[PDB]
Amino acid sequence: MHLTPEEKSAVTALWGKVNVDEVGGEALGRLLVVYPYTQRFFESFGDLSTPDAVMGNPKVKAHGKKVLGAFSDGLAHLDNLKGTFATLSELHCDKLHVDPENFRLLGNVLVCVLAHHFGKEFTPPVQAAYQKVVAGVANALAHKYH
Amino acid sequence: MHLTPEEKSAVTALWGKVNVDEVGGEALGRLLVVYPYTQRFFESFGDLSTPDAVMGNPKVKAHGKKVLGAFSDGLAHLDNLKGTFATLSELHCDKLHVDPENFRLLGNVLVCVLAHHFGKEFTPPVQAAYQKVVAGVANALAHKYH
Amino acid sequence: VLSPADKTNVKAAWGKVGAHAGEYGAEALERMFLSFPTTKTYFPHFDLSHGSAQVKGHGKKVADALTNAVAHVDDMPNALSALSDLHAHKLRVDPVNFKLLSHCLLVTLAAHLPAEFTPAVHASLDKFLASVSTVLTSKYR
Amino acid sequence: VLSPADKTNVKAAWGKVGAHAGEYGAEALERMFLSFPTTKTYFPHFDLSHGSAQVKGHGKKVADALTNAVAHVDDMPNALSALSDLHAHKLRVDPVNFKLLSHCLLVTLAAHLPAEFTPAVHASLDKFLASVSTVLTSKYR
Numbered sequence A, B: 001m002h003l004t005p006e007e008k009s010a011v012t013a014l015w016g017k018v019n020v021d022e023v024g025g026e027a028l029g030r031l032l033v034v035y036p037y038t039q040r041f042f043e044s045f046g047d048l049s050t051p052d053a054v055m056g057n058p059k060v061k062a063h064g065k066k067v068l069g070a071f072s073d074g075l076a077h078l079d080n081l082k083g084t085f086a087t088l089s090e091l092h093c094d095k096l097h098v099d100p101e102n103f104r105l106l107g108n109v110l111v112c113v114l115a116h117h118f119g120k121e122f123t124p125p126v127q128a129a130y131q132k133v134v135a136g137v138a139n140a141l142a143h144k145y146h
Numbered sequence C, D: 001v002l003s004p005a006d007k008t009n010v011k012a013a014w015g016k017v018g019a020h021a022g023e024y025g026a027e028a029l030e031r032m033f034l035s036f037p038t039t040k041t042y043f044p045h046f047d048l049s050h051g052s053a054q055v056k057g058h059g060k061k062v063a064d065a066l067t068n069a070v071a072h073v074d075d076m077p078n079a080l081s082a083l084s085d086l087h088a089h090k091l092r093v094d095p096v097n098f099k100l101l102s103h104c105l106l107v108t109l110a111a112h113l114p115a116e117f118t119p120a121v122h123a124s125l126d127k128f129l130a131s132v133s134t135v136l137t138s139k140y141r
């Protein structure tokens, strides 16, 4: 995870303006609407049959809040993503059985969600730093797969 | 290169038995035939219209030897793939303009090729270690891109 | 495959794009060049400085061809035929790169079209770009 | 799109596999789980140990669908429709994994059928597993 101080500053600064609860909700929802096969993991969440059903589902919203919560905490340990997410990695592999490729998909949607919210301020330079951060998190989450 | 002791040993021993001239010419040729769009870098080698023309082409053969020659020397530096291939990365990005994705393709062909030659001896465990080296080598070859 | 709904969603969104397409094409490219530097290996004869004119001129071109495909949404493989031959026989860009570009167009559209970039649209736009990338790639071998 | 030379190549290679299809599918599976461990997440109900009966049976199953596809080379989408529904609507396996199993099937064939795994035959089997993979992910969204 080679981020430059200018990049790290760019990532940390924008992140201060994010409302994680809501952004968390948009990103998990969109992921389930744009890549409907990712619903294989949430049969217990109830109705995910139409976009409104997904986006407004309370369970989808609470899980997105929880997913982004761990993400943010990662943003404060950008020099030790691997250690920060080790236990999470283990969980997603041995108990939940999640194909890591799904972390890459969420990363990319997150980037569309950030672009949608901040418009102009998500400049190309700022998107490049965020691509490196989403890739680094996805790799940290796959590190303990075996 | 999270290589296991018995993985390192599985790689070294098998390699000591490779005829680099042949395996190289076959690897590169097969790449030109199976992924024909890779011929874009090799316009100046001559006729490449047909598989026979590719596999017979001497410049293909010679360039193959050179490529596997450097991969070969890389197996002696497995603890330090990045530093070994630094210069070669710079050249591939700066003068040659080679999309690193091509490194993955050659890798996978390389592996079909060792199976074809060694048959029985190229067991699943042994393939698993070569997939690690090959990805490791592509990753190092791509490290200095900008 | 695109559904009646997808087609309708893509026409609506691209309609709002209107005459900024070029500009958005260029931005898509610049985003691509910075986020995924390996993609610059296909443009070594280009000036890639910010604001460069080859990038702008090329952005327009990309945008015209996407605009053409929206106009011929029911006959895309035929409307894009020439571009498909060109990419398969002369340019020979590795297929993974098409996804990279498609991602950057989405980010670009999202940043400029807050109200139209709903979840349903994002989705349809994403299937749309994937179909375009599939056609341009269909004759590679 | 598979050409006549490809169809022909595929039929002849698969023909020699003949009665070892099941063993080879099982082998390929086994190589994929060892080489690409992420693929295991789709089989948490299976006993993945070497020589397990689940991997075995699953081996023959995949191998047979493949036979049915070579034998139906001209009409794959129809031939594989139900298998294509199964993957899009139930199993929901991420597209990326189809390339990993494909490569493993090539290596298994390269290793068992040396004389037949010529460069053009390798080319042709590679396009064929790709169209099968395309067919199997066609109704994902």
Ligand code: HEM
Pocket: A038, A041, A042, A044, A066, A067, A068, A070, A071, A088, A092, A096, A098, A102, A103, A106, A137, A141
């Ligand atoms: C940014 C990447 C991700 C992070 C940081 C993350 C984090 C978390 C956290 C903190 C939990 C709760 C842990 C617990 O229950 O003890 C969780 C659970 C879970 N996650 Fe992940 N997650 C990520 C991506 C994903 C994605 C992409 C998928 C699947 C598409 C996924 C599927 C699940 C499932 C099924 C649960 C358990 C839900 C339940 O309570 O039934 N996660 N994740």
Ligand code: HEM
Pocket: B038, B041, B042, B066, B067, B068, B070, B071, B088, B096, B098, B102, B103, B106, B137, B141
């Ligand atoms: C296994 C990974 C690879 C290695 C280790 C490798 C290695 C090398 C080496 C040692 C040279 C000699 C450069 C010199 O003379 O200073 C070279 C040149 C070259 N390589 Fe690579 N190569 C790899 C993969 C590829 C790929 C896949 C391609 C394109 C598909 C490629 C394209 C080239 C080209 C175009 C040259 C220059 C040829 C010439 O002199 O005209 N390489 N490579």
Ligand code: HEM
Pocket: C039, C042, C043, C061, C062, C065, C066, C083, C087, C091, C093, C097, C098, C099, C101, C102, C132, C133, C136
């Ligand atoms: C959405 C997908 C894409 C579309 C619609 C598209 C369309 C076009 C068009 C219209 C041209 C102009 C050719 C002419 O003069 O008639 C072109 C050229 C070109 N494209 Fe594609 N393109 C796409 C994706 C890509 C990607 C992913 C790459 C590689 C990263 C790429 C690389 C090139 C290159 C190098 C040229 C030639 C540039 C020059 O030398 O002037 N394109 N493309």
Ligand code: HEM
Pocket: D039, D042, D043, D058, D061, D062, D065, D066, D083, D086, D087, D091, D093, D097, D098, D101, D132, D133, D136
């Ligand atoms: C050429 C590509 C593939 C073909 C032709 C194929 C074919 C099949 C077949 C014939 C079945 C059995 C259906 C039945 O019970 O009647 C099946 C099921 C299944 N496949 Fe696919 N498959 C392919 C690739 C994959 C991929 C790459 C994976 C993920 C790594 C995968 C995961 C599964 C799973 C988890 C099942 C259900 C297993 C069970 O519970 O018995 N398949 N597939």
